[PDB]
Ligand binder design. Sequence first.
Ligand SMILES: CC[C@H](C)CNC(=O)[C@H](CC(C)C)NP(=O)(O)CNC(=O)OCc1ccccc1
Ligand SMILES: [Ca+2]
Ligand SMILES: [Ca+2]
Ligand SMILES: [Ca+2]
Ligand SMILES: [Ca+2]
Ligand SMILES: [Zn+2]
Length: 316
Amino acid sequence: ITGTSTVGVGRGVLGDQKNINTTYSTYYYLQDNTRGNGIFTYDAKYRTTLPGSLWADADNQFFASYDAPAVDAHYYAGVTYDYYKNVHNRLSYDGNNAAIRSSVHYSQGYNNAFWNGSQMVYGDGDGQTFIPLSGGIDVVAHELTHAVTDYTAGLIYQNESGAINEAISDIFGTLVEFYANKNPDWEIGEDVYTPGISGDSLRSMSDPAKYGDPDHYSKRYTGTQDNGGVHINSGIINKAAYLISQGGTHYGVSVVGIGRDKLGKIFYRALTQYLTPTSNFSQLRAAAVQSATDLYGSTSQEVASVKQAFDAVGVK
Ligand SMILES: CC[C@H](C)CNC(=O)[C@H](CC(C)C)NP(=O)(O)CNC(=O)OCc1ccccc1
Ligand SMILES: [Ca+2]
Ligand SMILES: [Ca+2]
Ligand SMILES: [Ca+2]
Ligand SMILES: [Ca+2]
Ligand SMILES: [Zn+2]
């Protein structure tokens, strides 16, 4: 909407206060004009029609319980935008400052979040498996990263390409979490998963097997559930990424860590220059090796570490 840029204040899902960029025209709207062609957050009002209505508020204060998922979807979309722009020189998900749209309060008791081809969508959870999912910065960045993937590599959402698609979202979700630097970790969704259970998470990148996800190609799922295991086999690539960054010895194979920033550069380049819609795990290894070669040189530690990590997870 046309209006003037304003700064509201509110509380997120976890009870933390933050400032949010809004737009004033009669109401204060969750419309951040400070980034690209805007970040827009919508109320789906417990229904499944999308996007719903652009979030309107009378006083620019967002401290109601109902406001919390909107505050976080809006704010964490901003952090994710900043990560891609500042770290990778990428302007929004399409590289041309496309407007970023999110809807919260999607459906009832909805234990998921997704990119629907055009926008991000967040359930509130059922209060048992999840609380409102936009409360996780890794979750928000995971969703926006699906848009990035769809505009770039275009990895088909099934089987190996789909597991790469998933891992890319977990990797960048995690790198954005580290970028914001509030309780960062290599776990996925810990801030919004299972409020009655401390210390767990939806997935682990550092040890995928702790939740039954494979950490080696020989343990990959080959059935038809979950689009051929896209949220399961992602563990193999998540583990490789974790090893590239942090190092470790895994099934007897030692990997020298090169740090998060270099992991991000290598995978961003692979995603945007080398991967295609049908890339499999072996082709991802080749893409990562070539990306590291471009960035650091064929004889570099970075290239050697990429090879070690994929060796460790059984991907040749
Ligand atoms: C394995 C269970 C979990 C909840 C699956 N969902 C997830 O891992 C994450 C959310 C996490 C980060 C909290 N959501 P996601 O974006 O991967 C859900 N994906 C999914 O809905 O795709 C299916 C889809 C939807 C719309 C258009 C085309 C395809
Ligand atoms: Ca208000
Ligand atoms: Ca965390
Ligand atoms: Ca996390
Ligand atoms: Ca929990
Ligand atoms: Zn996903």
